[PDB]
Amino acid sequence: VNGKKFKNFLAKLYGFGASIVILGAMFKILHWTGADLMLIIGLSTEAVIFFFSAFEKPAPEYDWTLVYPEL
Template identity: 55%
Template sequence: MSLRSFLGSRAGKNFYNICYCWGACLVILGAVLTIMHATHANLFLMIGLCTEVFIFFISGFDEPSREYKWERVYPILNDKNANTDPHVARYNVKTVAGGSANYQKALEQLNRNVETLNELYINKLNELYEAQIKQLKNGGSQMDVQESTRKLADEIAALNEKYRKMLDTMN
């Protein structure tokens, strides 16, 4: 296990936290004992400082935290003239009003797309189902029915893939 993966694990974070806290405690204790001119004060101070040096050294191998682009989630963060006082207004009126119209258009387009896919899905299923019924009435063989069932399954899989792609784009 590498140092980076260890520091990223729960045990590594616990170890790092314990070393950091104990090192800080020993530095403070050593400083207090040095001020008081106590015996072994320099030893405590040196142990604490060496622990802190070790902690700062291994912190260089720790993976930095991710920086999130919050302005993509909250576009108001990009607006320099936005009212950010929570007591005055909860939202910037211009941003909400403009965003509302765009949101409504996107929602209507999404609804149209879902309705179109649903109609396509139902029509394909009905066509294949009617073809199977027709084959059975005309004395079609078991192989013909199996082939048409396989086609039906392929069509359903293709339509499910379209639904999956649409859901992936929405997320």
Template identity: 50%
Template sequence: MSLRSFLSSRTGKNFYNICYCWGACLVILGAVLKIMHAPYDNLFLMIGLFTEVFIFFISGFDEPSREYKWERVYPILNDKNANTDPTVTKYNVKNVMNSTHSKALQQLNKNVETLNELYINKLNEMYEAQIKQLKNGASSADLQESTRKLADEIAVLNEKYKKMLETIN
């Protein structure tokens, strides 16, 4: 395995990170010991500095990060005369709301509101049914059954939400 492929691997990146951090720690420790005139201060400083030299040497073999061509995704980046003022651009939110998409957005908003109302109404119905059961002295089996029904209703509504989100995306 070559040094370049090793440094590109997960193990190589972990090794590089550990060496880099330990080298920096030893340099700082050596500098602190040097300031304090402690024993072995020169040794710690030199070990840390040599570790950093080693790290900077092997970093020359590391693959550089990939440059992305953002102008392919956003062609406006190539246009020197592009208008970047959000209040003037043709894709302003106000313009989108007034365009042909307006009907679709209004219908989607209406569907979401209807689904929200349905969700809240179902939850309220089931909650009220459970309270009535508690007041009437229902058994724990009855409460478990109504709780299971509530969970089933929530699961059905969540599926509807999921489908709606999938159509939006």
């Protein structure tokens, strides 16, 4: 489902996902031990977000001219 209980989880998952990519990018820059483990988890999360965003409903795209003429 893609209502509110999932979209709320899909919003937390994006915040945690982009943190792990950047931490993984920092560890890779510094050549620290677990650099590619964090890049795996961070990049996989961002690919999950991108996948599930294709099924989201398109934006309502409200029109205001028809109710506020010549805007």
